[PDB]
Structure formats: structure tokens, C-alpha cells
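Agenda item 2: beryllium trifluoride ion complex prediction
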Amino acid sequence: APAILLVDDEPHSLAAMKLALEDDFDVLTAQGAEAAIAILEEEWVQVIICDQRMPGRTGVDFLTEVRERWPETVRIIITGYTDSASMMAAINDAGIHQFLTKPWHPEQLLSSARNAARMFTLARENERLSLEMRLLE
Amino acid sequence: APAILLVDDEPHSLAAMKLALEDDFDVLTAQGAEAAIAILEEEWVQVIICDQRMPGRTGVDFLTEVRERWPETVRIIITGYTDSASMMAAINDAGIHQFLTKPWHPEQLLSSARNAARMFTLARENERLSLEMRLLE
Ligand code: BEF
Ligand code: BEF
Ligand SMILES: [Mg+2]
Ligand SMILES: [Mg+2]
Ligand SMILES: [Mg+2]
Ligand SMILES: [Mg+2]
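Presented output:
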């Protein structure tokens, strides 16, 4: 089953985000870029959420690669420093579907999640149709 | 072009929500259920957002019908009274994709919007494929 990947510098927000999502998804949790890529390798992930402000590699960077190695996956950013334009510009260059502000309702953040996974589902069958309708003409 | 429908009891939040979205969508605004249905008649709408707490008819009710008369349209609820279970249950029976808490970032609420419209787009071509791949077998 498609899980959701949680990826934040502070391990107390993975803790939280899980508490909000665990009841509905298979939550996978990671402490940063290099740590997280490791997981998308072995396990299968429908949705990912990433702190932007992370030591070393930023969410936007991580996700530029995620976009490249596993394009079937819905990418989401999350920020408490929502006031910066540089960021948004960065966000707006990458293929980032949702950007959430901190903090967040257990039921809101939960929703941006159910979204992503419904979306991941559309996109994924939206492609099936194609592939299979190619194998006709 | 597909617009977005805004539908809230307090005309000062339509004011706001527009200010957040106008730069990116064709915003249509309505003061409540009966008022809003009137608009989906003449004009074409890809995304709708509805206050739950509205005199007379509630968002969830409105949207149950919207779901029925214009199913191609992405439905969204928005609440400041996020603590009620009755609601969520109601929300969870209807076909409601996103539920936002008040208040909201200009760039968050903005995003739940861009979401919806990308989604409205998937769903709508996801169907094209079908219809057209039916006209083969
Ligand atoms: F700093 Be992260 F964006 F919360
Ligand atoms: F009362 Be609405 F939900 F803001
Ligand atoms: Mg629990
Ligand atoms: Mg941080
Ligand atoms: Mg403006
Ligand atoms: Mg109200």
C-alpha cells in the first residue's frame, strides 16, 4: 500500500505530523534529505511532506530530485517562515503541489494529505489510460 | 476559462478570499446557497469554496447538490469552528475534497485553490481518456 513520507529537521514535528496522519496512512518518517532518499528506495510512497528550513539540504532541493527519480509521487512543502519571496520563487520553479504554513490543524494538515493521495491516484490512473490507449493506435 | 466560486455568509471574507485569489483565478463571489447556485448556471466553474456556518443552508448541504448538478467541479469547505465532530461526519459523508480552517495564509488558501484547479484538470481529462477509449472497444 502507498505510504506517506514525512521529512523534517526537528524530530518532534515528525512525531506530530505522524500523530495527525498515522490513523489514515502508512507513515514513514525521515530526519532529512539523504536520510529520506534512502526510504523511497526500498519502500513505496504516494505522498511526501518536507520542512523547507533544514540543515544542509532544503526541502525544495530534495524535492527537485524526488521529482526526477520518482515522478509518480506527490510533493509537498511546509514552512513557518512564510514571509520570504526568494523561497516562493524557489518553490514556484520546482514542481511543488502544496505548500503549508506552520502551524496546522491535525485535520487540515491531515487533509492536504488525503488530497495528495487522491491526487496521486488520479495522476497514476490518468497515465494508465494513456499508456493503454497508446497500445491501440 | 474556468473560474473559482467563492461563497461565504460574511461579505468581508469573500472580499478577503478574492484578494488572495484574484491574481490567479477568475473569482466569482456569492453570499450563500441560493445566491450561488444561480452562478454555476450561467458561468463555468472549476473550483468552489464555501463557509460551513451560513444562515439558512450550510456549505455541506449546498455542496451535496453541487456534487449532483455539476460533478466536474472541485468542492471545498472552510471553517473557524473546527472542533465539532457532527460537522466532520457531515463533511465526511459528502464528497468534499478539502476542508480549511480559518484563518488562513493568502498563500496557503491560495494554494488549496491552485490544487483544486490542477485536480479539476486531472479529473476532467482523466475522463476524456475514458470516454474516448470507450469509443474504441
Ligand atoms: F522551517 Be520549516 F519551514 F518549518
Ligand atoms: F464558520 Be465558517 F466555517 F467559518
Ligand atoms: Mg491518535
Ligand atoms: Mg525547521
Ligand atoms: Mg493584490
Ligand atoms: Mg461564518
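Discussion summary: Chain B has one domain: 1-137.
Owner for follow-up: CH.
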